[PDB]
């Protein structure tokens, strides 16, 4: 049932950019773009929580053709316009140090994508991934722990759950469980999809909780910048109590480095009831209820 590898890098789907729109507001750190691609003319189908590959143009420093980079699909299966014709990505421009004055390095594929024009043709592969799939059970609980562009799979879940047009398009999935997004970004301008996440919470105050960790605007109890692991620690007992439910699924997505703190917080919660979290978590992973995609 799950679509996988309908296109492969030896013969990718050539899609066209429909739109490329900024998600970081003025005063935010960095560049994150919402990029929508036209899928008409091919048969690329996908579901929520999957990824696609993008093959950037050009050669690397060794004169070899650039390989695909993976990006989490940011739209539901129907695409943003609920027409089954498009796919969207949430792409941050990678840029970093190499310790010289002004000398910034820009990532190949992410710079290509964040600056791409509508009408441009792009090499797309996939979809891939079966580790971040959403349960069909409408009564499932869904905990979402995201930093930065790790919001992307979370958006596909929340849009399927809560967008009016999605609910109209998916008679079989009328979500009535509880979902909780804890979302970590450096600033309020950097809150990707802020308006829509908050509109969802206002519509569905009993089915959706939104928690932010904004590092440059908030401090944890120890005086440090507020990160997602601090919010998990702050709510560790509630999160553990939700996780004990047989129908609760947890999803963790974003750049690597978040998991150690999340585990330490949940380990302290579970230990209060004589449970060793690492063991409970192993069984949760085996059961398909602990989902991680960090990069
Ligand atoms: C499953 C999956 C899903 C992903 N989803 C998304 C998504 O939704 N959105 C998104 O923006 N990205 C996503 N990523 C990451 C994405 O695939 C690319 O790795 C990223 O966009 C950078 O690619 P690039 O071509 O821009 O960089 P490259 O040009 O390959 O640059 C990256 C290389 O430079 C180095 N480098 C990177 N950062 C630093 C640093 N701080 N200091 C020193 N050296 C460094 C490393 O050698 C790294 O291999 C995902 C990755 C995976 C594996």
Swiss-Prot record:
Return the EC number.
Answer: 1.18.1.2
Residues binding NADP(+), per UniProt: 72, 92, 149, 185-186, 215-216, 225-229, 254-255, 293
Which of this chain's residues are annotated to bind FAD? Answer: 69-72, 90-92, 96, 108-110, 149
Q: Catalysed reaction(s)?
A: 2 reduced [2Fe-2S]-[ferredoxin] + NADP(+) + H(+) = 2 oxidized [2Fe-2S]-[ferredoxin] + NADPH
- Domain of life, per UniProt, equals Bacteria
Keyword Cell membrane annotated: no
> What cellular-component terms does GO give this entry?
phycobilisome; plasma membrane-derived thylakoid membrane
Q: Which UniProt keywords apply?
A: Antenna complex, FAD, Flavoprotein, Membrane, NADP, Oxidoreductase, Phycobilisome, Thylakoid
Q: Which GO terms describe its molecular function?
A: ferredoxin-NADP+ reductase activity; flavin adenine dinucleotide binding; NADP binding
Q: Which protein family is named in the record?
A: Belongs to the ferredoxin--NADP reductase type 1 family.
Q: This protein is called what?
A: Ferredoxin--NADP reductase
Source species of the chain: Nostoc sp. (strain ATCC 29151 / PCC 7119)
Taxonomic lineage of this organism?
Bacteria, Bacillati, Cyanobacteriota, Cyanophyceae, Nostocales
* Gene that this sequence comes from: petH
